[PDB]
Amino acid sequence: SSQIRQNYSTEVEAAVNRLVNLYLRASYTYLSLGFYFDRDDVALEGVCHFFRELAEEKREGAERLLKMQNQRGGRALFQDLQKPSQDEWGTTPDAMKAAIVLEKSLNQALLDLHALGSAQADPHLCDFLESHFLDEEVKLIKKMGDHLTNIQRLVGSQAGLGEYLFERLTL
Amino acid sequence: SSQIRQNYSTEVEAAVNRLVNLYLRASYTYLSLGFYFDRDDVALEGVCHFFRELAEEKREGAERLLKMQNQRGGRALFQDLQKPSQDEWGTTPDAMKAAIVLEKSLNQALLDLHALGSAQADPHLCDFLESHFLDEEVKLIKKMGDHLTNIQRLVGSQAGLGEYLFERLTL
Amino acid sequence: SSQIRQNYSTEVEAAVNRLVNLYLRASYTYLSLGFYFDRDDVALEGVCHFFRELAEEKREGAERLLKMQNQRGGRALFQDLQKPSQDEWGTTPDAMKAAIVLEKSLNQALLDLHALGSAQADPHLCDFLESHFLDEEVKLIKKMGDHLTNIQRLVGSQAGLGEYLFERLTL
Amino acid sequence: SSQIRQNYSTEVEAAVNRLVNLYLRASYTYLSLGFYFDRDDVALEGVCHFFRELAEEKREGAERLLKMQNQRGGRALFQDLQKPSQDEWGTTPDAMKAAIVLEKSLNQALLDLHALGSAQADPHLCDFLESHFLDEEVKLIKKMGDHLTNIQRLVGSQAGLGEYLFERLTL
Ligand SMILES: [Pd+2]
Ligand SMILES: [Pd+2]
Ligand SMILES: [Pd+2]
Ligand SMILES: [Pd+2]
Ligand SMILES: [Pd+2]
Ligand SMILES: [Pd+2]
Ligand SMILES: [Pd+2]
Ligand SMILES: [Pd+2]
Ligand SMILES: [Pd+2]
Ligand SMILES: [Pd+2]
Ligand SMILES: [Pd+2]
Ligand SMILES: [Pd+2]
Ligand SMILES: [Pd+2]
Ligand SMILES: [Pd+2]
Ligand SMILES: [Pd+2]
Ligand SMILES: [Pd+2]
Ligand SMILES: [Pd+2]
Ligand SMILES: [Pd+2]
Ligand SMILES: [Pd+2]
Ligand SMILES: [Pd+2]
Ligand SMILES: [Pd+2]
Ligand SMILES: [Pd+2]
Ligand SMILES: [Pd+2]
Ligand SMILES: [Pd+2]
């Protein structure tokens, strides 16, 4: 039951639960990315740290969504969390590309939810997504794109040397 | 006269004045709630303080609306302020229910104004209501709902004991 | 590949991956427990906080296992994470009982892994599990049992009052 | 003579003396590695420092073993210390490979002693080796493997440049 729910559609409630699942899936993907770079035969600790930090950020995003769900009087519903798409993540450019694909997918899900909110005349949702998720995603994706460009620039010269230098000097 | 008014409809100007009246009415209701709990035959000071704090918050909301009215070049117009709905407010659950009804009414008025702003293509109004009122209302209503649930849980056990414990340990 | 793996069986490597899955599942269960207690119709914030803290602890346990996996030259392998056993968690005693069942299951998995380590003559694993997991589990389970006893004592008197008092005064 | 010896076999006493010899041999090997990298025609000071630090660590390990020998009432017996396996240590990858081989040999000797302790029902020895040697070895070997992977990655690109960069930026 709820004694507080107001202007909060079942459609938005369901979409928020799905977004929680997507954020937790992303966190899990970043956990796997991080530990892959910590392998003794990979051993790029700046890259490991970068992804471990992202795993934390995505978990925090899920938690913020869940807090909002409860603030509005909706009910959190959890589903199975699928394992990440890969067991091994290839090179640093491969990994950074995968991360961009992942963030773009989260960003599109946020845009889809916003569109739903707007269609449902739910301005609290719009404002929530704006100042807490959409700007953060744009900033993160810019950072990732910058990183990808730098590593691509480096590995076009010499791959081993380039991966080492990027990890040491950027990350 | 105004030398600054831009994209600010007479409809929004009037709705803002009405919202000021609603916020000042709410402040007055909370003043009455607060002093009822300060009666020597009621004597629940945490409850008195909770409502007195809300009286302040609602007055501050009205003042923020008035400041915005002037920033946009609209003209504040004040109307009579009707007295609160009750002279005596019953039990703590009765009072908390009344507060939730009141906040939901303010929240609906904010949503109605936002809808008007959106219909009038007035994005300053949308942004103003978002970051200054709509989030605050959602947070407050969640707090009130939490409080109501706790007091209901307590007075289902033993009413006198429950009201005392809630006032001492939550408020 | 690995250039470091020594005295680390494929059996232990696989069991460690399974234990990671169990710890991440436990973290997910505690996330769901926490947010259930944050519902406006439940509203026991000390209970929410208790479970949210446990969600963090279990995630940290998984991360420690993964770090150890890599230290030994094993390879992390992630599987799907099943959703928690319940969507709604009942009363505080119901929830605390569920938590004890969960921790006992983790403890048994640790004991099973230790037995495997001992059978595989892997003293690093034994020492790792000892000073980092087994003592922590015993301490946590004692705390949970103490909590369950207190809430049972309280709700045998009066359920609503008891749940409120436990949340306010213990948690 | 001893007035304190209890549950301490002659087999374990002898094995501890042999382990002291192995640790002192390792210290000597690291001394030679360190000074090789300090040669004016090698001149990789981060590599020199890395190995000199290890020489200290291994000497400290021997001293801890000797202290334990006396704590248990066993008698330290010293043997000749053989010179290191090489006079010149080749490239940075050559040296790091040699270090890994050396640490694996110490780790295996620790495992062999632990197995003896367990067979002799000597839990003090097990606990001593656990919290003071086995974890330290696993951590060190992981670090070495990480280093080897990085230098291999670098010298696969360009050897001179790679050796310089590793010494400057990792060490
Ligand atoms: Pd790492
Ligand atoms: Pd890391
Ligand atoms: Pd960081
Ligand atoms: Pd919007
Ligand atoms: Pd928006
Ligand atoms: Pd917005
Ligand atoms: Pd008062
Ligand atoms: Pd007061
Ligand atoms: Pd206050
Ligand atoms: Pd809007
Ligand atoms: Pd808005
Ligand atoms: Pd806005
Ligand atoms: Pd909470
Ligand atoms: Pd909480
Ligand atoms: Pd805490
Ligand atoms: Pd053991
Ligand atoms: Pd053990
Ligand atoms: Pd142990
Ligand atoms: Pd030197
Ligand atoms: Pd040096
Ligand atoms: Pd140093
Ligand atoms: Pd042992
Ligand atoms: Pd041991
Ligand atoms: Pd031990």
At A146, which amino acid appears? Answer: D
At C15, which amino acid appears? Answer: A
For C42, the closest of B147, B149, B157 (CB atoms) is B149
Closest by CA to B107, choosing from B8, B9, B30, B22, is: B22
Query: What are the residues facing C81 on neighbouring strands?
Result: A81
Largest CA distance in chain D: 63
Q: Which domains does chain A possess?
A: 1-171 (1.20.1260.10)
Q: Which two tokens stand for residue C63?
A: 């991360």
Taking the centre of ligand 5 as the mean of its atom positions, its distance from the CA of residue A136, in whole angstroms, is 13
Measure the CA–CA gap between B18 and D132, rounded to whole angstroms.
75
B111, A123: Cβ pair inside 8 Å? yes
Q: How far is residue D45 from each of residues A167, D35, D167, measured CA to CA in Å?
A: 22, 10, 7
The data reach a resolution, in angstroms, of 1.6
Cβ–Cβ contacts within 10 Å for residue B7, how many?
A: 12
B153, C163: Cβ pair inside 8 Å? yes
Q: Which two tokens stand for residue B144?
A: 């009130």
- Solved using: X-ray
Closest by CA to D19, choosing from D83, D143, D107, is: D107
CB D22 within 8 A of CB D74: no
**Chain position carrying tokens 């400041």:** B67
Task: State the DSSP code for C54.
Answer: H
Q: Is A81 helix (H, G, I), strand (E, B) or coil?
A: strand
> Cβ contacts of residue D132 below 8 Å, gap of 6+?
D64
**Chain position carrying tokens 């991966």:** A163
Task: State the DSSP code for A130.
Answer: I
Q: Which residues of B have a CB under 8 Å from any CB of C?
A: 142, 145-147, 149-150, 153-158, 161-162, 165-166, 169-170
Q: Which two tokens stand for residue D118?
A: 């367990």
Residue D4, judged by CB atoms within 10 A of its CB (0-12, 13-18, 19+), counts as: exposed
Element (H or E) spanning A42, and its range?
none
D149, C70: Cβ pair inside 8 Å? no
Alpha carbon D84 to its chain centroid, in Å, reads: 13
Q: Is C96 helix (H, G, I), strand (E, B) or coil?
A: helix
> Cβ contacts of residue B97 below 8 Å, gap of 6+?
B148
Measure the CA–CA gap between C24 and A34, rounded to whole angstroms.
16
Question: Which runs of consecutive H residues, i.e. helices, occur in B38-91?
Answer: 45-72
Residues of C in contact with A63 (CB under 8 A): 31
Query: What are the residues facing D101 on neighbouring strands?
Result: none
Q: Which residues of A have a CB under 8 Å from any CB of D?
A: 40-43, 45, 158-165, 168-169
B103 is in an annotated binding site: no
Q: Which two tokens stand for residue D153?
A: 């990655």
Name the neighbours of D, counting chains with at least 3 Cβ pairs within 8 A.
A, C
**Chain position carrying tokens 């070049």:** B73
At C101, which amino acid appears? Answer: V
Alpha-carbon torsion (D137, D143, D149, D155), positive or negative = negative
CB B136 within 8 A of CB B42: no
Task: State the DSSP code for B132.
Answer: I
Cβ–Cβ contacts within 10 Å for residue B156, how many?
A: 14
Residues of A in contact with C83 (CB under 8 A): 78-81
Closest by CA to B76, choosing from B22, B32, B21, B116, is: B21
Residues of D in contact with A162 (CB under 8 A): 157
Largest CA distance in chain B: 63
> Cβ contacts of residue A130 below 8 Å, gap of 6+?
A114, B130
Please state the three-class secondary structure of chain D as a single string: CCCCCCCCCHHHHHHHHHHHHHHHHHHHHHHHHHHHHCCCCCCCHHHHHHHHHHHHHHHHHHHHHHHHHHHHCCCCCCCCCCCCCCCCCCCHHHHHHHHHHHHHHHHHHHHHHHHHHHHCCCHHHHHHHHHHHHHHHHHHHHHHHHHHHHHHHHHHHCHHHHHHHHHHHCC
